[model samples]
Target: AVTLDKDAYYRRVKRLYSNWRKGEDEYANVDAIVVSVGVDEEIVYAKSTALQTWLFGYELTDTIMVFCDDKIIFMASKKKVEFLKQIANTKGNENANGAPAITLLIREKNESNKSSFDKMIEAIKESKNGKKIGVFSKDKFPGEFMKSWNDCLNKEGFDKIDISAVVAYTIAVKEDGELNLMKKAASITSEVFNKFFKERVMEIVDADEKVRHSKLAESVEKAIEEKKYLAGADPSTVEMCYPPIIQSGGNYNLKFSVVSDKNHMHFGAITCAMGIRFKSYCSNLVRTLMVDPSQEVQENYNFLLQLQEELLKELRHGVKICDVYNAVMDVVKKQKPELLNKITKNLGFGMGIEFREGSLVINSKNQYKLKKGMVFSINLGFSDLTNKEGKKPEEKTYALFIGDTVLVDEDGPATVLTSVKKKVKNVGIFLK
Candidate 1:
């Protein structure tokens, strides 16, 4: 429940700017950097959040930050100017040496008519730093904004270079402050899951088919709300990335579906996948519960757990991510080759300020080496293992899934952040 150190964020920004200047890559010549937080720009929220957290304690939406030579400018609505100035003038926000001067620009009500893109362009032009501008790009960039920015940059005769890799590499590795927040987030996430399972699992086990799935989902939300204060983050910042996925029986699509009376939760597997965000940092957990399960179902679930255990062993520092994926596949090829096709392609992806960092995905094609201080959600799922015959939902067939938020350590196997028990005996529920 401890608050993040504001000075650490300021120092983080300082180090990022310094790294960009020292590199010989595209970022070296880039005289200005532009980043913002708005609709369809959630990918860049990590940087925006870091900047806001450094300047103020929490995030301020619709804000833009421009990094020019020897100066940093922050632009936001007029109402925030007074508050921002008060923090900007505060001592110790910046280091004594090598800190860029700070500037604050207030967007008047009349100027609100201008789009964020236009405002960004104006800010860059006003800086008069250089023609080359660096911007972060991700797979999830808003198409409209991407096209508009590309056209605007071309029309203005300015060079727009993607610095996504640089930014990703920087944030992909967690700092001490970031790791502390993430650990707290993960602990809170585990508390929610454990509390729900302890207090409400039997209700779900005993509920009628008409209300089982909805009951589980509603209770998960209630648990999140009750445990959110433990995060010590802004009340609004602590929330779920999506509705909890509660797939009981043969409903194996693994997504949030319509609440149907047809859904049942007896004599089959129940997969519950949920995540919680604290101050923009995320932790995810997926656990499958078994109620009066068949021996085949129990064995298959144990195999899935073993697969995850092997996968976690390979998530150490200085190892290639692709190699880890291959190693896990090799284990399946040797022990459970039948599940080769049943399992998912990507074992997991990196987690931090953003829920998922696309650049650090753990898949075959990615050759990036794992580094110490990186966090990941290691997930193993076998789809329709109980429904080899491809039966209907009424057949009581289900899938098995297990996941946890883990961290790469300095010298040993990865550390698991989520700590809810997943042993075979612990997950089984008896109705007799």
Candidate 2:
């Protein structure tokens, strides 16, 4: 039961983030988001805790309580996530005694669309490829919807604490016959995630702080007098949920160029670069699990395969952002309109703190496709210590809201957010 001095714990975690100006390449080249779920009797008795088995061989000092600094995010790089998955599956097959049942609920399909996609496919067939105006009335699709794959599972009866399984909330709205869904571009954007994650994190922490872990029934005695831990932005809240270390862009143009090569690839390269810099400021997010404080924290995972097939691919079914960009470029390629008069690209990536919606929305267009192995250099304004203060768009792809934005990088319509690359590329493993 190691205990840390309150003030020192704060300073250590902050310094670990390099929140200061040391200007040195830190170990791991990665930072982690830490989250704390309050404790419960399941943890003390160890019988009901889901993580109990995983925490099994390792013995914590009996008298010492686990302190903040003692926890870690494992930096489980994207590579590590894959390796773990592979090894777990391999072990599951080779032997029986020791195997991994790791189904990191980190990423899952938005199954709510099972019916929606079917309808879209049917409509595409019925219209003979003709455009159909699908209604987005608020009444039927009112309020936000969580992922169908995400929800509390049916409990085995006693039906109390720890019964609620993993839950994934939403950001897009289905209101007034109008639905603003999670954009392909929006997922990589920090703003879109900030809004979503913050709300979810707050909801869990706040709920845990007020409830006692053991004897859900007995806790009522304490609740009658209204007792609970204060929910504040402490190390548990701040560090536990940080976003990431290196935020990279997808460079959809690279994928596009893989299909065709021209000016459009360059557009995607630059637009995505700006987005990379934009999203970098938000990579840190705290981590929590079914139970917030205990060792029941979420295991680091990479859901690239799931993300591509389930989430990103769905965008093409809708209006293509790149198509619009190409259309704008069509006017140029045909020499039918003034270059300055037409929109070029849409420039938008999410910010780190948006939970309710996207942080920024820029118009990105593409008339050309991105070729293989093409990554553009990131050129951002000098990060002046104030990460959240006075951030501006990089100069190369400047937009005048009333004029040019990131819009022309798409020659063929694909809603892949240029923010994340789903393919298993040579993304270096920054953590050991």
Best-performing candidate as measured by lDDT: 1
Q: What 10-residue stretch in candidate 2 is worst by lDDT?
A: 163-172
Error of 1 at 381 (Å): 0.7
Q: Compute the lDDT for candidate 1.
A: 0.70
| Tens-digit lDDT string for candidate 2 (37-64) | 2223222212112121112211111111
RMSD of 2: 27.4
Q: Candidate 1 — which residues are off by over 4 angstroms?
A: 1-6, 22-31, 39-57, 86-99, 111-129, 137-157, 207-209, 212-215, 227-237, 254-267, 387-393
TM accuracy, model 1: 0.82
Q: How accurate is candidate 2 locally (lDDT)?
A: 0.22
Residue 145 displacement in candidate 2 (angstroms): 47
